[PDB]
């Protein structure tokens, strides 16, 4: 009988991969052919994005169920590890089955297969529940101390077959880290896959000048740079926030899920923004899309912190309470990105023809603002203390 930490970490890694699987078709999409084949390509792109969002939400629901199930189960043994492996294996099929269902809604086979997958997940979780309750010493201390465990043995089974409830903070952190890491390095995978200069390619087009062939692919490298920087800074904000949380609630979990779902779209936004169009109006539209995606990504982290503030008296560390030693700094740190993204958006309307340059300048502004945030907060508070 051993601690279950590592098996839950492995399960969280698997769940991150499975949830974010369906992003690959979106980034691997036929991005931009000239002469505006959009009138027919945009239906495909929108279908792919919708499938991505739906699959991510479904897998997140499955992950939440898993987190609760192994919250009631405290310890692990050789049998529970294998049962959890079976549960993970059956979970891994949800994206493909959902995509098949949406692809062929009229044929009942897809819906039947999705139902089969859900039933399998439920059955395996029920087996885990039964195994745990058949051996009392595996349950969490609270459950096996209680005398009503008999009712819980059926209650949890009924669940597996509200906003104030706790989630596992550790598993929220693990899943969020997995998703952030997958997204940040998303479009370096394809660069490695297909962007190394072919010897014949350089020989014919670039007459053997490898430097010319390399520079021909600058835009995708720049897009990767921007995407990684933005996603890393969003993760930094998330990490700073969650270093100060005592307990995580279901509302915070839902807001985190929304934040991650919207974070997932940044690689596409940057790929498109560096996929230069024929005329600059499309470029302004691309910048607007990037700004709105970033705002949507970060506003939900800010919303999560504000929601936790409603019960700070129990939910947060004292250092972040109202009037705390770092409350102002935390608010500024979480509000930075939404402000910059919103201003970059508004610039497209107010100072349109300079907005692309303003977006580029904002990309450089935000990281430095994060780096000096404590110093700038101190300076601003010192200035405003006597006003």
């Amino acid at each position: 009988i051993q601690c279950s930490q590592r098996m839950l970490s492995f399960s969280d890694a698997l769940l991150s991969i499975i949830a974010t699987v369906m992003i690959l078709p979106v980034t691997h999409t036929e991005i931009s052919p000239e002469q505006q084949f959009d009138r027919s390509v945009q239906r495909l792109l929108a279908t792919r994005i919708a499938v991505y969002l739906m699959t991510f939400l479904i897998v997140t629901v499955a992950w939440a169920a898993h987190t609760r199930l192994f919250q009631v189960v405290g310890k692990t043994d050789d049998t529970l590890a294998l049962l959890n492996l079976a549960c993970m294996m059956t979970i891994t099929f949800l994206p493909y089955t959902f995509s098949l269902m949406v692809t062929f809604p009229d044929v009942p086979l897809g819906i039947f297969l999705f139902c089969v997958c859900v039933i399998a997940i439920g059955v395996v979780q029920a087996l885990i529940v039964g195994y745990a309750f058949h051996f009392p010493h595996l349950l969490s201390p609270q459950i096996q101390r209680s005398a009503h465990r008999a009712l819980y043995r059926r209650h949890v089974l009924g669940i597996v077959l509200d906003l104030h409830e706790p989630l596992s903070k550790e598993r929220v952190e693990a899943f969020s880290d997995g998703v952030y890491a997958i997204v940040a390095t998303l479009l370096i995978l394809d660069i490695c896959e297909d962007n190394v200069p072919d010897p014949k390619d350089v020989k014919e087009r670039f007459s053997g000048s490898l430097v010319a062939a390399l520079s021909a692919t600058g835009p995708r490298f720049l897009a990767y740079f921007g995407s990684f920087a933005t996603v890393g800074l969003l993760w930094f904000a998330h990490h700073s926030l969650f270093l100060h949380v005592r307990k995580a609630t279901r509302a915070m979990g839902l807001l985190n899920t929304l934040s991650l779902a919207f974070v997932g779209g940044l690689p596409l936004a940057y790929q498109q923004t560096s996929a230069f169009a024929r005329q600059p109006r499309d470029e302004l539209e691309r910048v607007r899309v990037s700004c709105t995606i970033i705002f949507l990504a970060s506003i939900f982290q800010l919303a999560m912190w504000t929601t936790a503030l409603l019960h700070q008296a129990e939910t947060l560390q004292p250092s972040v309470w109202f009037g705390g030693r770092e409350h102002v700094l935390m608010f500024a740190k979480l509000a930075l990105y939404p402000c910059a993204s919103l201003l970059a958006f508004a610039s497209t309307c107010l100072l349109s023809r300079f907005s692309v340059g303003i977006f580029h300048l904002m990309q450089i502004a935000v990281p430095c603002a994060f780096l000096l945030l404590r110093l700038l907060v101190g300076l601003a508070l010192a200035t405003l203390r006597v006003l």
């Binding site: 506003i299 800010l302 919103l342």
Partner: peptide, 28 residues
């Protein structure tokens, strides 16, 4: 066109965040 409308939706989102923060402050 829509850009200003979607910007207004963004403004509404930040406004609900602000109202949540102010409610928390008032509760203290």
């Amino acid at each position: 066109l829509i850009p200003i409308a979607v910007g207004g939706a963004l403004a509404g989102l930040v406004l609900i965040v602000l109202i949540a923060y102010l409610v928390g402050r008032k509760r203290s």
